[PDB]
Every structure is written in C-alpha cells, then in structure tokens.
Amino acid sequence: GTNTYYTVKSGDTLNKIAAQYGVSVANLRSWNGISGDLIFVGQKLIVKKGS
C-alpha cells in the first residue's frame, strides 16, 4: 500500500506527535513495535492511515 514514515520533530513524545498528526497511539505503535514514549527528534517512526 503506502507508508508515511516520519522523523520525529518538535513533539518528541509519542502522545504529542500522535495527536499532532492525527494517529492513535495504538496503531502507530503497532507498525513501529514501540512500547512507551521512547521517542526522540530524528527517530524514524512509521505512520500510515487509511486502511
């Protein structure tokens, strides 16, 4: 399909970025395999919604 993998920008915390670009903590965690808020600027995290 399609994937929008995004480098963590200002909003270094999972809940902050998740709500920032409109994705649930649950799904973006699901395709990243992340437990917790172990996120920092520069980290490459997947975010893709639609299906």
From Swiss-Prot:
Transmembrane segments: none annotated. It comes from the Bacteria. It is found in: Secreted. Residues 4-47 form the LysM domain. Belongs to the glycosyl hydrolase 73 family. Hydrolyzes the cell wall of E.faecalis and M.lysodeikticus. May play an important role in cell wall growth and cell separation. LysM domains are thought to be involved in peptidoglycan binding. This is Autolysin. It comes from Enterococcus faecalis (strain ATCC 700802 / V583). The chain holds residues 358 to 407 of 737 of the full protein.
